[PDB]
Nucleic acid binder design. Structure first.
Lengths: 60, 102, 479, 445, 359, 331
RNA sequence: CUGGGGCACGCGGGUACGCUAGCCGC
RNA sequence: UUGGGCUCUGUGGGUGCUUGGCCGCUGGCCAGACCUACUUCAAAGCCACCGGGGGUACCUACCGGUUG
């Protein structure tokens, strides 16, 4: 894709080919590429356990 | 022909010369005889292996001589005939194998 | 008369490009509307007429083969003989790629014909550019892959992984994992509406954006794990086939299924649909495969048998199709003529790819070269069938050979013309038609013995005193 | 009989050229989504013309010391305008040298009510002190006039001949009087023969020359002729009228600008009904001018609003303003019918555009293709709610929008009282008169 | 990268261009001009210039009128080789090779290489007939036309026999005879292919002196190097190596020994079998068999040199007698003892005379 | 560029006549396939930005031979309905874009004019000649062709218009002056054949202005004498011959061209007993010119050229021919 | 004058050409 | 021991216990062949994996209603 011109970008503000609002600014990519993990699966496994502990803290 | 020479020259000029260009590009008696083959006949449509060797959808019972002829056609369709199937001193030495001894 | 050819031209043009029955001009009361609509229908007729007049400018011819003698039948034609028959152009295009040690290969072709994508269920995904024979991406992905397909061009592709669904860019990079559509076993891409359609094992169906990234519609298709999936590229809708053997036809704009046709008594194994928009052939777990019109929702002829319940079906651009069943696949030619109001069964098929222990995984057509890709558990291959594919294209829609400039041009054009996903219907072009209830409300606001027994029996449980029920009670008393 | 489709890519690009050959096919089997696709293209069309809906193009001059209460374009050259002040001064600009002035002089004591140019070169000034004539494009400048009149009372307006050297001066004594240049002194005094009520303005017709219409303060208009030197007809309407015009293509079609806050399209042969009702304002309209296309119309309010129009809507196609311009007065077109002029109360001559999103110049072929494509698509779909609301959504100043809500509520109550009187009166057994029929009160000879 | 190597094999097998840049590149690979003009060259003016050269060549030699009919036509403008079927392409290839053998003599000249330019820029001859074109310009290995051909060949299209120029195609420079012949030594198949071309040339009677002189130098130093390794010292090894050598050189040497129409290739065959005799310790039966085919095949212009060959042959023979038909044809020799004194003035003909008088 | 869409317009223009030819049996499917493909390739290379009027003429002759072959096949097939008009019009469109593209190729100009003059577009040919003559005001070839076809059609006044404007513009070469005097005297001969004009003073007047023309050469006046000496069968031919002779004798006294015309003067209407007497008179003039003091080599080259022409005229006496041979060898 | 409407536009032999103006057919 | 070395590449075997290549198989084929029939009756429910705290205008779903 080329860079849009004026009207094209103005019409498709919400367009983006790279990052969605379902991507969290690629926190997965950020973590794995700082620390060399090999399964982004395993990243998300860490995230789910971290979220579980965080919510246990919330009820605590 | 009903076509003029100048007319056909125009045809070669504008229309093209694809067909004629393709044209320019594409420029023992048998010793012994048997009677058993004339006596014999075979059921082609009954024969599944021999089924695809007919010429029409009417040839089932075929005599032995014509049957062996269709066998020849099947065999040549399977494998086309080779060029050796179509003296000089060193050629004779060459075919001599006593020339190759250890 | 000499004008008989003129009238036949008129009939054929009005059937082809008329885009509708025609406007009645004499029922008009008003003079301005009448003379203006006269000029309109005049210009429309001239338009369709010169469309027929333009229809000659196609460059290519239509591919075919015709059996010459009486014994000769098309499904007794061998592929090496096709090689010796036809030109070195396509002879550089028939081949076989034996990937052996990674499971049954699933393949798909690019929407333009430039590229193809391959996945081995036990780990492999490679996208390669076949005509120049060069590969741009190949990565062994380890985790078991359940599905694969390109996205809107050869920039990106999309894969159903072992838990998530991924979109990669062309040089191998993973653009993003997607955890919103867990456990996909079927994936499609609505290509004009810019939408991934994700069907999972649980029965969840999610229409997700790609150009701005929201899922627009998740639906609990309550019935059955979806045994199979494809999509109609004329309504742009979803033909999904369920374990009850029924096919259900879906659209993103109501939770209910939109049609639910019935098919073979056990789970319909495979589906495929016309691209012009006419028909749809399925294969069931019950060993029969058969067709249906879609605009009329009907079986046409009796169900064809298959000698094994067919694992896949890819129908071509034209009326041809390859049906893939077990260890060898077959190709039929005329399974639905457009012009015939009723159809026929056909005794003999067109041509086959034969059974040498190469169990098919699926089959697809290149949409723009008369070739046939067979994904089998011993790799990918492509044989040729001359009738296949459309013959003369519109680069305005899609070019098999776009430059970098036309590529970026087309991406911006498609982004400009992305179609808001509410406009999905059984009726494709229904836009600007009238709302009956709303137009009745508009006209109203402008111009402003046997049923009464069920009426009383239904309203005896309310129990509003209901002055209209008082009128009804007095009328029942007079009765 | 095997034969397949064989495309070389030579048919995509011929060896020896730079042209990418782009063959098309026209099968609906290949081009789906026709209706919704063009609909989307229409949506993007509307959104981009309201990206580019940029009307303003400038403010000439320095602006007159007090506000513009008189201005007039030369209609036979292309770039010469006289604008004359409230403060009894006039000057003329050239369009091309936008910034500075062509020629400047004071003209009267009181506010200059009228101004124009002669068909040869000279220019003309009415005010209550009198009628004067200067020549701006003299090679040395003079400030003194070269013609004058003081007789006929306060002269309210001018009107000049399309081709010849005729002009007419509307006074306030219920009298108009016509001069011919170089051959008249006091001109012919014509009026409704027993009439005093004042004549605001008068426009010479340019479709049928030698014809005159004028407005009178009896909420009444009078059509005149010059061959037969007499008034022709007098129409009396509900409330007053402010400035006249006739259409420069459709000869029987005239238009009046009315304190009904309304532009009325009438037709000379038949005054039985208004041909069109333009109910487009809050405050009363100060000016009208027909575009020389005959297809467009400026209605310049008293309030902070120009509204631009076709001949056949009945409502607002465009609203224009900016807050530097409190009360527009003289609102007239140029000779391309593309660029309008706007003489304010705030002492300004403004140069604006009609069809406010069309960027002029010399386009490229595909450009005008796209523009008229947008035109056609919008034409096809100009009714649907989505594109419709993004079409009619302009922006509007606060007192004006509050007041148009006020007008709608009050007139809705008025119509409610009217229909209640009808339904519960004996008016129920009669024909409902349509509104353009209702438009006229009476007509008189 | 398994599938990558497999697709690479396909990409080697790819012939007709399928994306715009590759089309432009193979379109612009030319001979006469530079690629920057070649890209903005179209067939028409190309046909003009090459047709001018072609008419010059057909005015030089008569035998170009068949390709005036079939390969240099207004239809030969439009015909694109890639679009037809394999038998059409085979016939076209035969027409090519026939024209190449027809044109191989007048090689160093501008109208002929203009014709070559039409061959490339219309019929992709550099891609489709790499072997025959490469062999037919191979004997001109010090001229810049050959240099430019080496410039615009495709590398993966060069034949397995012919892949020796790879250092030179990395570095443009005319390779020398020592390089070609060293490949002929420790690469038999180069000799095989060039032998096949030049024998086809003499069989189609289109032999010419530059060709045959090149081929003489090639075979002579080639088989010289072949024996110069094949001498091993081990007994049955040298016998068996001479066997394998004879099997390689058999057909070409017999066809050139009794190539009756072409005296030059008769002389060259005399040369190669003479060196075969004098250097290599060959067995008497094989030697007399050479004698017998030479006897079968000489002429009178080739007479005295063939006499020199028989002096070599019998001089390196070990037995003292000759086998028959040799003596018959030496009776048929017109000026025997005079020619024999003339040759024994420098050549030691004694064993030949002894075998003669024994017979 | 935008060649795809512009060629789409032009091929859509070409469509319906080919549809007519396919519903006729005059051309088959493969033939019309070949035709449309060729026309597309043509029009593409035509509308290419880098362009040349040679390829323009290629497309021109291609469509022309199309109209020809279709007419021939139509006549062989005994068809009457199909015309050539659409082919003419598309040929005209090719030419029109050609001339808007290249205003600099006079050869292509003449090609357009020849095609029009053959196909009978009279007023069109006149207007196209007008345009191109405005474009190139410096070719006497163009001016002469204009006035010549006007003199051929018979509009002598419009011939005078074109020729007089050309004389007003082109003033470095006397060639159009030669041809204008040629067509003026040819019109006068046409008047004498249909038998002021009785005087015939227009070549006198054009010589009077030529006398002070910028290209004023003695050899130019000699060529004026030559073109005046052509078609000497008139009324005032002796008058104009005497006038030009006395004019150049008054201006260039000792010029070898003046001596050459003094030799070849009385042979105006010669070709018969009047031939050898004037031959002997001109031979006396020639001997006087030979003995007079002028550039003898120049005069001898003039006389050997004119005498080679005389030898090219047959039907003479051998004694006269041999004495010409002697007087030629003695130079 | 793309204002609109009406006449003609091909091949033969003629009357006639360093040409095509006129008669009838195909 | 009548030359030898390093280094790289290519092929086959084996790196696990020796029962056919294919098919619409109680049978057929490997040169194959035959090709589109026949038809009494849709389905029983449940389950079904998204990182946490937080908001709910609109959409979806659930529950409970309402006009028809």
């Amino acid at each position: 894709v080329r860079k849009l011109k004026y009207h094209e970008q103005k019409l498709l503000k919400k367009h983006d080919f790279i990052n969605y609002k379902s991507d969290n600014n690629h926190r997965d990519h950020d973590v794995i590429r700082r620390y060399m993990i090999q399964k982004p699966e395993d990243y998300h496994k860490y995230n789910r356990l971290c979220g579980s502990l965080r919510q246990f803290a919330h009820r605590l | 022909a009903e076509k003029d020479a100048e007319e056909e020259e125009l045809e070669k000029f504008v229309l093209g010369a694809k067909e004629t260009f393709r044209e320019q590009l594409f420029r023992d008696a048998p010793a012994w005889e048997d009677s058993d083959d004339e006596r014999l006949t075979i059921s082609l449509a009954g024969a599944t292996r021999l089924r695809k060797l007919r010429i029409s959808e009417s040839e089932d019972l075929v005599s032995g001589i014509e049957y062996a002829r269709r066998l020849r056609q099947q065999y040549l369709r399977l494998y086309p005939q080779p060029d050796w199937a179509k003296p000089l001193p060193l050629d004779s030495f060459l075919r001599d194998a006593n020339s190759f001894k250890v | 008369k000499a004008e008989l050819d003129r009238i036949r031209r008129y009939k054929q043009a009005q059937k082809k490009y008329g885009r509708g029955p025609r406007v009645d001009i004499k029922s008009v009361r008003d003079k301005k509307l009448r003379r203006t609509l006269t000029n309109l229908e005049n210009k429309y007729k001239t338009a369709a007429l010169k469309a027929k007049e333009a229809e000659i400018l196609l460059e290519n011819q239509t591919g075919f083969l015709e059996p010459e003698g009486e014994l000769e039948r098309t499904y007794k034609v061998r592929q090496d003989e096709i090689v010796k028959e036809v030109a070195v152009e396509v002879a550089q295009k028939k081949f076989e790629l034996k990937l052996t040690e990674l499971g049954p290969y699933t393949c798909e072709y690019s929407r333009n014909g430039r590229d193809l994508i391959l996945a081995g269920r036990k780990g492999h995904v490679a996208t390669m550019d076949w005509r120049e024979g060069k590969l741009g991406c190949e990565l062994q992905l380890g985790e078991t892959v359940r599905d694969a397909r390109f996205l809107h061009n050869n920039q990106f592709f999309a894969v159903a992984q072992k838990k998530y669904v991924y979109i990669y860019d062309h040089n191998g990079v993973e653009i993003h994992c997607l955890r919103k559509h867990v456990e996909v076993s079927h994936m499609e891409f609505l290509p004009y509406h810019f939408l991934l359609a994700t069907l999972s094992i649980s029965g969840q169906l999610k229409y997700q954006d790609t150009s701005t990234g929201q899922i627009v519609a998740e639906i609990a298709t309550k019935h059955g794990t979806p045994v199979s999936l494809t999509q109609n590229p004329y309504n742009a809708i979803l033909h999904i086939g369920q374990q009850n053997g029924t096919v259900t036809l879906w659209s993103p704009n109501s939770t209910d299924p939109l049609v639910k046709l019935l098919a073979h008594r056990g789970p319909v194994r495979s589906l495929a649909v016309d691209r012009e928009g006419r028909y749809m052939v399925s294969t069931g777990q019950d060993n029969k495969m058969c067709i249906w019109d879609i605009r009329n929702f009907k079986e046409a002829v009796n169900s064809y048998f298959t000698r094994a319940p067919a694992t896949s079906v890819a129908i071509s651009d034209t009326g041809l199709t390859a049906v893939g069943w077990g260890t060898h696949t077959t190709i039929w030619k005329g399974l639905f003529n457009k012009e015939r109001p009723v159809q026929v069964k056909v005794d003999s098929p067109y041509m086959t790819w034969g059974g040498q222990g190469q169990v098919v995984e699926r089959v697809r057509w290149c949409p723009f070269e008369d070739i046939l890709g067979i994904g089998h558990n011993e790799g990918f291959s492509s044989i040729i069938v001359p009738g296949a594919g459309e013959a003369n294209y519109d680069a305005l829609e899609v070019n098999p050979f776009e430059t970098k400039k036309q590529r970026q041009e087309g991406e911006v054009k498609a982004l400009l013309n992305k179609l808001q996903p509410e406009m999905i219907a059984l009726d494709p072009n229904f836009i600007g038609n009238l709302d009956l209830r709303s137009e009745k409300q508009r006209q109203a606001e402008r111009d402003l013995n046997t049923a009464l027994k069920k009426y009383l029996r239904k309203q005896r449980k309310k129990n509003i005193i209901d002055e209209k029920r008082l009128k009804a009670e007095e009328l029942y008393r007079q009765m | 009989k095997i034969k397949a489709l064989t495309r070389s890519i030579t048919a995509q690009q011929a060896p020896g050229s730079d042209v990418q050959r782009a063959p098309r096919n026209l099968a609906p089997e290949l081009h789906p989504f026709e209706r919704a696709r063009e609909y989307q293209r229409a949506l993007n069309a509307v959104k981009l013309e309201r990206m580019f809906a940029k009307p303003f193009l400038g403010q000439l001059g320095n602006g007159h010391v007090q506000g513009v209460y008189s201005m007039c374009k030369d209609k036979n050259s292309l770039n010469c305008i006289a604008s004359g002040s409230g403060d009894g001064v006039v000057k003329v600009w050239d369009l091309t040298t936008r910034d500075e002035e062509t020629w400047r002089v004071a003209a009267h004591n009181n506010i200059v009510k009228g101004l124009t140019f002669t068909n040869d070169k000279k220019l003309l000034s009415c005010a209550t002190d009198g009628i004067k004539l200067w020549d701006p494009y003299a090679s040395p400048s003079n400030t003194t006039p070269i013609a004058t009149w003081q007789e006929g009372g306060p002269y309210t307006s001018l009107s000049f001949h399309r081709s010849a050297n005729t002009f007419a001066a509307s006074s306030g004594q219920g009298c108009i009087r016509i001069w011919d240049l170089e051959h008249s002194t006091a001109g012919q005094a014509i009026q409704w023969p027993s009439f005093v009520d004042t004549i605001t303005d008068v426009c010479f017709n340019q479709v049928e020359t030698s014809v005159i219409g004028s407005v009178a303060t009896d909420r009444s208009i009078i059509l005149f002729d010059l061959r037969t030197n007499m008034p022709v007809i007098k129409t009396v309407l509900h409330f007053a009228c402010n400035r006249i015009v006739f259409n420069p293509m459709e000869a029987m079609n005239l238009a009046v600008a009315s304190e009904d806050h309304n532009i009325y399209i009438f037709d000379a042969r038949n005054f039985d009904k208004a041909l069109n009702i333009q109910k487009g304002h809050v405050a009363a309209v100060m000016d009208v001018e027909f575009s020389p296309t005959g297809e467009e119309l400026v209605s310049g309010s008293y309030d902070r609003t120009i509204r631009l129009w076709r001949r056949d809507a009945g409502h607002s196609r465009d609203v224009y303003h900016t807050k530097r311009m409190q009360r527009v007065f003289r609102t007239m077109w140029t000779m391309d019918s593309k660029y309008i002029l706007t003489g304010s109360d705030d002492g300004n001559v403004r140069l604006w555009r009609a069809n406010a999103s069309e960027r002029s110049g010399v386009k490229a072929t595909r450009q005008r293709q796209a523009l008229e494509y947008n035109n056609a698509l919008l034409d096809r779909y100009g009714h649907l709610p989505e594109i419709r609301r993004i079409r009619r959504h302009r922006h509007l100043p606060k007192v004006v929008k509050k007041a148009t809500e006020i007008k709608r509520e009050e007139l809705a109550a008025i119509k409610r009282r009217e229909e209640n009187e009808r339904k519960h009166s004996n008016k129920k057994y009669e024909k409902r008169k349509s509104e353009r029929e209702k438009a006229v009160l009476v007509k008189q000879q | 990268s398994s599938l990558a190597q497999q697709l690479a094999q396909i990409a080697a097998n790819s012939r007709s261009s399928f994306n715009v840049k590759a089309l432009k590149a193979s379109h612009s690979k030319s001979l006469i001009w530079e690629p920057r003009v070649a890209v903005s060259q179209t067939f028409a003016e190309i046909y003009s210039q090459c047709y001018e050269g072609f008419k010059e060549l057909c005015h030089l030699d008569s035998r170009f009128v068949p390709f005036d009919a079939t390969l240099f036509s207004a239809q030969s403008q439009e015909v694109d080789r890639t679009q037809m079927t394999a038998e059409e392409n085979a016939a076209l290839d035969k027409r090519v090779d026939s024209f190449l053998h027809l044109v191989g003599s007048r090689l160093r000249l501008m109208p002929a290489i203009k014709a070559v330019e039409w061959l490339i820029r219309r019929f992709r001859i550099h891609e489709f007939n790499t072997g025959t074109l490469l062999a037919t310009f191979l004997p001109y290995h010090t001229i810049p036309a050959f240099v430019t051909l080496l410039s615009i060949l495709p590398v993966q299209r060069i034949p397995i026999e012919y892949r020796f120029l790879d250092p030179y195609i990395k570095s443009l420079t005319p390779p020398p005879r020592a390089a070609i012949v060293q490949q002929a030594t420790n690469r038999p198949d180069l000799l095989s292919a060039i032998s096949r071309y030049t024998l086809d040339s003499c069989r189609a009677k289109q032999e010419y002196p530059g060709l045959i002189s090149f081929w003489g130098g090639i075979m002579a130093e080639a088989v010289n190097g072949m024996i110069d390794k094949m001498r091993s010292g081990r007994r049955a090894i040298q016998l068996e190596n001479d066997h394998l050598l004879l099997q390689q050189i058999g057909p070409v040497l017999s066809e050139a020994m009794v190539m009756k129409d072409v005296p030059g290739i008769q002389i060259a065959s005399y040369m190669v079998v003479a060196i075969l005799a004098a250097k290599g310790s060959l067995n008497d039966n094989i030697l007399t068999a050479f004698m017998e085919q030479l006897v079968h095949g000489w002429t009178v212009d080739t007479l005295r040199p063939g006499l020199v060959c028989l002096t070599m042959l019998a001089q390196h023979r070990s037995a003292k007698q000759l086998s028959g038909r040799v003596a018959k044809a030496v009776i048929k020799v017109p000026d025997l003892v005079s020619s024999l004194r003339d040759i024994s003035k420098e050549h030691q003909v004694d064993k030949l005379a002894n075998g003669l008088v024994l017979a | 560029a935008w060649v795809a869409d512009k060629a789409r317009f032009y091929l859509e223009r070409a469509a319906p006549e080919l549809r007519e030819w396919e519903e006729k049996e005059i051309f088959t499917k493969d033939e019309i396939r070949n035709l449309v493909a060729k026309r597309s390739d043509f029009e593409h290379l035509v509308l290419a930005p880098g362009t040349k009027p040679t390829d323009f003429l290629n497309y021109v002759n291609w469509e022309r031979s199309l109209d020809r072959l279709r007419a021939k096949r139509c006549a062989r097939l005994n068809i009457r309905s199909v015309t050539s008009h659409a082919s003419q019009a598309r040929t005209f469109g090719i030419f029109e874009r050609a001339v808007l593209k290249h205003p600099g190729s006079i050869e292509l100009w003449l090609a357009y004019l020849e095609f029009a003059a053959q196909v009978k577009a009279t007023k069109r040919w006149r207007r196209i000649m007008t345009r191109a003559l405005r474009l190139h005001p410096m070719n006497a070839s163009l001016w002469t062709l204009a006035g010549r076809r006007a003199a051929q059609n018979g509009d002598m006044q419009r011939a005078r218009a074109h020729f007089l404007r050309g004389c007003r513009f082109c003033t470095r070469e006397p060639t159009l002056w030669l041809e204008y005097a040629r067509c003026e005297m040819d019109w006068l001969a046409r008047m004498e054949a249909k038998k002021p004009a009785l005087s015939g003073a227009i070549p006198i007047a054009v010589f009077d202005v030529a006398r002070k023309q910028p290209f004023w050469g003695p050899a130019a006046a000699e060529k004026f004498f030559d073109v005046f000496a052509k078609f000497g069968h008139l009324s005032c031919h002796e008058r104009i011959i005497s006038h030009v002779v006395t004019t150049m004798q008054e201006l260039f006294p000792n010029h070898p061209c003046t001596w050459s015309v003094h030799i070849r003067q009385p042979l105006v209407g010669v070709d018969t007993p009047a031939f050898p007497k004037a031959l002997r008179e001109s031979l006396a003039r020639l001997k006087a010119a030979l003995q007079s003091t002028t550039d003898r080599k120049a005069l001898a080259t003039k006389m050997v050229a004119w005498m080679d022409g005389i030898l090219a005229i047959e039907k003479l006496d051998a004694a006269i021919r041999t004495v010409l041979e002697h007087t030629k060898r003695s130079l």
